[PDB]
């Protein structure tokens, strides 16, 4: 696991910077090539990678799934991809104009919701910065290039604070404050300035989306007991390697400073592990059946 | 004597011009001139007029946005109401000269006002008063003009009933013998700084000469829309010659050679695209040096390997690459910490292109027009080095509820900060601060004239005369006159005021009216840096990726072509991850179908600052669980042994 | 013996981790102080200098400026007083019998990066000026500690001051200069003619007796009461000039007010040679030393006017500072000793 | 001057989480390189030693030895190279204006546990050279990372190895320590007489001593003269290197516990022993002038003077070792 740390850390990085504006058979057609180029420069890297699997933590999708999030993977893989955007304003492209109360919902009463045809739009958006609340702005086609410099992150740094300039007064920047810009055109005309500095992630649904949707209705439908008892064993399995890893901190707690009976459940923890990999290894492939088995229905759907 | 713009080399063709301009305005007839846009049709009129006993001119610059006013006022400070008007002269008579008639508008009818008055005023001898209604006859007063052709967009086709008055004569490009007269006449005057190399003025005359002819022949306008060329970028390769030789130290003809190749890359090659071009530009360099100047010791003439510049010392000499990347780093340092602070990577595109924004920024009247992808670093490069050169950057804030009142306030504060605080300033346009075409037009004043009339009028023209009197007599000068102090406004502003357009989307049809304007083609300096090639997005990511750790696993080089290494070859994990990063981008803007438009590299840099902080958590998760079950595996060693002795 | 010439080389040089920024010279004993980039305030022992005699990390940001001076009273100790781009001054006691710093107290008031320092004494009462990117030139005082006169001189942000017992001069980065009355805060005269922000500025001290010095010997019995004559400033257009300050309104007893006619300061002599930023200066006797980011030093002379040696590739990277001993002081000897201090990790000392 | 000293009470004691294994200088700041038995690298200074300025875990097991260099070649930057028991020799480089550590690269291609490194540089080259215990000696570049050579000098594990010029001496398992050129690859002489493994083998280098001074023209046009080895048997052996077998000079003794590390300053000799003391030993008399009693509590593994010979390295009076004690004493002026 670590011969493939660079491999996965660079389908990982571009995965983010570059696959946000991607519908699903755009993101599997440069995966193939960012594979293909990964195996011909002779770097290794994770044969059955996923992003979900990888960079998404159980407990993060869980909050994000709670919080209004659709169950398709499609949108998880957006939703890391927008919250994993540290050093840029990611840019949500929500048609169904779904997201503003997700992200409300996680973030709580902190979220103020701003505007681009507001009347007292920078005076309200400098008094969030100040005091460094979660920023929604809708309508993000109509972007004001007043906030020019919250976009470029250019800031000045007077000694022990953080400073923007907006408009002709100058105002602090709080280390809490986050901007998230919300649009709902997939028509419309994102200035080149913004676009190019934004992580521009497209909420929208496809034929693609439309494909993975039908599988989805038909496996939560057709056969519930599959899904059922794979997302059993994942969270069994999840829940089985926190405890085991507790005892392991726990049992060398011990031996630093009963241990047989600490043995006894840590060996006990392992043949359970060993007995979930087990019966797991004979679950994917009647999934990838399943798969094989479905796909007339989706192309007689697009 | 050659940064002076009336000075015109008597030529066969310039006294022709002339004498047939003399018959035709002693004839009573109009003139219209028209021709290519480099052509001369300016210059010769002006020296044709200037030169006369019997004629004195009136400088009139058409725009879009031109009345009857603007002719009505111009001729009433060269003339007397006694009807009857007359010049004030009582011999010589008063011509009154436009600058291409083409470019006043049409109404919402298809009729220009001032091709119509001019025609009713040299038809009928006289015009109407407006506010009070009678004939103002006109005796002598004469009306010229000159037009680029109705072709090209900006140049409306114009009616007959108005040229049917005024003769045409179209002024053609000068031929081979004769551009190569009029530049050995300036070489030789330039060369009189030098006198040891005074043997060597026809060869370089003859070099740029035919330059400049397979420049035209080779970058046609099919390849871009802005491939034109003309006797105007000889005669600006001839002023940079002659301003790098006399700032500069003592020459060799080495020395010469390369100062001349580099002045031929700064002006015939910065509109250049495509890669290709190029290079193809660089075996011309090549091929006229060695045809007109066979000399030996030459180094290498590509675009990255001549530096000259005059940071590094008090005179304007070829710098060493490394000692100008240092001294670029740490002035970039302190820029960073005084100013805005951006994480910059240093390479050689960058200090090339710091080096012609240098270049253009210490001319007189010297402006840019920088051409590029987003991302590419325009704004902060020329903000760094109006920053280097001591002038003062003005952004114009200008935002969606923003109209012609902010964006002129702006322009009357940046101007009078000029005239009478005596600051230089470096006013930085992007194609976002326009937002309808009266900016355009307003650039289009500012840029080709040294000044915007209708921004003072009327009282604001009464306080800017005040102004201008307060800081003549605060100066120590005496001007009397309403034009001296006019002159002396339009020449601080032109001497304290340099325009930088950053134009990001050149396939934009409102980019493509910033580009083919006549005011900004003509007087700025294109500077197409465009997207980053392989060389300098390489040299970013080894910048980039060397302060993460990466080497830690074993690694065989692979076997791979010699075309597919953009790096250095592949020795380690991290030329490979860089041959890998650079390859997927190239992929990704090939099936995201960018077309010919520029390619920005702002996912490439995202990418690689995400790589770089991803890698370094997991390198460092991957440490911890390494030592943790090491550990664990040591203490279970250790009770193992103590419970086998015991 | 003010004639004196460094060598065509250095005596002993001294390794720094990071950037050098200031460098002063303990006035009794050949001990060099260097203030890196980090902050961490460095003594050398000059003819030991392989390891640090003694070191310190004060502040948690770059210095940028640094001055000491030796108390005179009427017990007697060397007060190192630095300041940093982490917005407070921090004054120091240099104590010998440990050979370790003694840190006495620190100032606090700016609130943005402090660029120059000079501390001095008038009679028994010693004073610390700073100026800042705040534009205030505050003064403090070493025994209370609390802050007594403050002023804003200049539109944009003072860069360098000096002192001279009432009278403050004080260049900033909006190209001006300007002479300030300190006890009541009148500024009493500007100066132009700098195209680029000033880097440092001092008063030209006068000689008691010299052969010929034309520079630092008064006019008349007026510029004799006035106690100075001219001044020198180096900006980063690389040009080093000479000024005169021009005479206000004076009464007995009473504060000094500008004069409205002759309220100017006048070019006397410009300096040009400087292939970069001229970043320090200093004068000793007869002879102007400079030093610019042509990681040169350069000893121009008052009596005429151009350069005699020039020290080119004295440092890898550039050259920030220099220190020579106050010549004009009584109790301040001028021992034949120049200091150097540059970017690239080093300082370079010339003795003998 | 190089007459220095060292006072007989300690200046500086830096305190480590676990025992110190290998103790490096800075060749021109206060700064030591201590490393400890978990892998991590602790960099500590001189004048403020309560925190540790930086600390990095390089690898995963105890670290077996390491060695530092200032690069002249391109900026000037101080390489760092540490091998541990993970069969890898990573390399690090110290940037002073953030004071802390950077990894370049792992250089790995040994399949048993490493026991030293040594860095030295060419005109325009660095190089690496470590010793394993499967019996090999391989010859690394700083830059490319690859493998330049790949000679077994002895049977057995090698313990202790130096590089001088193109020849290299390794002391093995075995008592026969055995001189190979660098290039070429082929051993030349070849030297027995320690009752025990050989724990520090390196060269003498000339310097203007007893065996420091070359004896003959053709020795001195060689430029090696003698090599100090230090084996198990609990003494310390001089060599000869002819111009087929080395041959023995001198014999020091009075070390109660195996000799872990020697070093050489000018005309006198230090070195560190299992028995809890440091000795300073004359080269010329080859009598011990003054000897430390409890300077740590546990065993003394590592002592580090500064380079002598070197005209780049500035030969200062500073002397750190490295005990067993978790804790590194600091011999300061
Ligand atoms: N006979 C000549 N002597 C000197 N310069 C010439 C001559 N003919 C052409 N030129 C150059 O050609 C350019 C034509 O410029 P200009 O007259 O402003 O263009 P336009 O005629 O389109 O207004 C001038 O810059 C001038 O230097
Ligand atoms: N070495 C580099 N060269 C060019 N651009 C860079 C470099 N390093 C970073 N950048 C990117 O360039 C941006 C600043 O460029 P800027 O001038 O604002 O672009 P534009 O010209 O589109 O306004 C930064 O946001 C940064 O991400
Ligand atoms: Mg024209």
Redesign the pocket.
Known sequence: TSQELIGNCIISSIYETYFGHLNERERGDMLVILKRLLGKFAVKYDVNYRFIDYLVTLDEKMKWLECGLDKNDYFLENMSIVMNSQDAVPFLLDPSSHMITVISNYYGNKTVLLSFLEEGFVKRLENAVRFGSVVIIQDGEFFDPIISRLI?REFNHAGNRVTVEIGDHEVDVSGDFKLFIHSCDPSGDIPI?LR??VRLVHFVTNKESIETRIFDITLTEENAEMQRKREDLIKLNTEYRLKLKNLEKRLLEELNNELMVTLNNLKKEAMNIEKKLSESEEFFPQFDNLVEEYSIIGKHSV | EVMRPDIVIPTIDTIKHEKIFYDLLNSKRGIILCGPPGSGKTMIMNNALRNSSLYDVVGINFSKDTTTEHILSALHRHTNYVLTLLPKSDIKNLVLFCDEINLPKLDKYGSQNVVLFLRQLMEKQGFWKTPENKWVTIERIHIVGACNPPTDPGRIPMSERFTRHAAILYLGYPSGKSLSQIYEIYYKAIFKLVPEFRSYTEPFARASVHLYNECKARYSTGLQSHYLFSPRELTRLVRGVYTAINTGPRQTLRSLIRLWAYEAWRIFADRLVGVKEKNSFEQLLYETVDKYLPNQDLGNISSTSLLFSGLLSLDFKEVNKTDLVNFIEERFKTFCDEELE??????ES?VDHILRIDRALKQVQGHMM?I??????????TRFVAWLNGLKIVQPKIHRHSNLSDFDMILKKAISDCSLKESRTCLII?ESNILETAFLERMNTLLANADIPDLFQGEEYDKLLNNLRNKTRSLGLLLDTEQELYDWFVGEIAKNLHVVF?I?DPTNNKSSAMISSPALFNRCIINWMGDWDTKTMSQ?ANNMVDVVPMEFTDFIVPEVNKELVFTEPIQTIRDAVVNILIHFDRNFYQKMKVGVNPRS??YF??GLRALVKLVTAKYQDLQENQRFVNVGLEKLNESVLKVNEL | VLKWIPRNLPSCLINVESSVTSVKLHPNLPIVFVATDHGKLYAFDLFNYTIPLASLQSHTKAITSMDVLFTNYTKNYLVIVTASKDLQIHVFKWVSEECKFQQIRSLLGHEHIVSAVKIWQKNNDVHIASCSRDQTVKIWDFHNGWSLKTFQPHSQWVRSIDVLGDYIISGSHDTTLRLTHWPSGNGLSVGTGHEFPIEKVKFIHFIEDSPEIRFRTPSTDRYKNWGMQYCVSASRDRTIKIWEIPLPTLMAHRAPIPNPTDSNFRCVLTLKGHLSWVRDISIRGQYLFSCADDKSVRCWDLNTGQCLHVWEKLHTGFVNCLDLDVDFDSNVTPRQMMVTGGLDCKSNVFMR
């Open positions: 470029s300035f190019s500095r | 951006v994480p910059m990577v240093i390479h960058m920088l590029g992808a987003s991302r590419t670093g325009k704004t902060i490069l992007d950053t990001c970013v590299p702002g840099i995202d």
